């Protein structure tokens, strides 16, 4: 019963270490691309057409 708790606890430590490793991956470059991706997201087609509207465009 309580034994499983210890095993899970150990795994938690591994997860924390991974976070630091991710930093070494130099995600700064990828982070820059994400910023631009957000801009393109606002250009969603859904936003172009409103659900409430029906006589929009042809």
Domain residues of the chain, as ranges? 1-58
Q: How far is CA 5 from the centre of its chain?
A: 29
**What Rg, from alpha-carbon coordinates, does the chain have?**
23
In the structure encoding, which two tokens stand for residue 11, read together? 């795994």
Q: How many CA atoms lie within 13 A of 3 on its CB side?
A: 1
CA dist 47 and 41 (Å) reads 10
Experimentally determined by: NMR
Residue 28 CA to residue 5 CA, distance in Å, equals 36
CB within 8 Å of 50: residues ≥ 6 apart? 56
Q: Tokens representing 20?
A: 């630091």
Encoded tokens for 25: 């991956």
Query: Which phi and psi (to 5°) does residue 13 adopt?
Result: -60, -40
Q: Is the dihedral of CA 12, 13, 19, 24 positive or negative?
A: negative
Q: What one-character DSSP code corresponds to residue 56? A: -
DSSP letter for 23, please.
Answer: H
């Amino acid at each position: 019963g309580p034994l499983g708790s210890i095993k899970e606890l150990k795994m938690s430590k591994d997860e924390i270490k991974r976070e630091y490793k991710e930093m070494e991956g130099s995600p700064e470059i990828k982070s820059k691309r994400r910023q631009f991706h957000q801009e393109i997201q606002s250009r969603n087609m859904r936003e172009n057409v409103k659900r409430s509207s029906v006589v929009v465009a042809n």
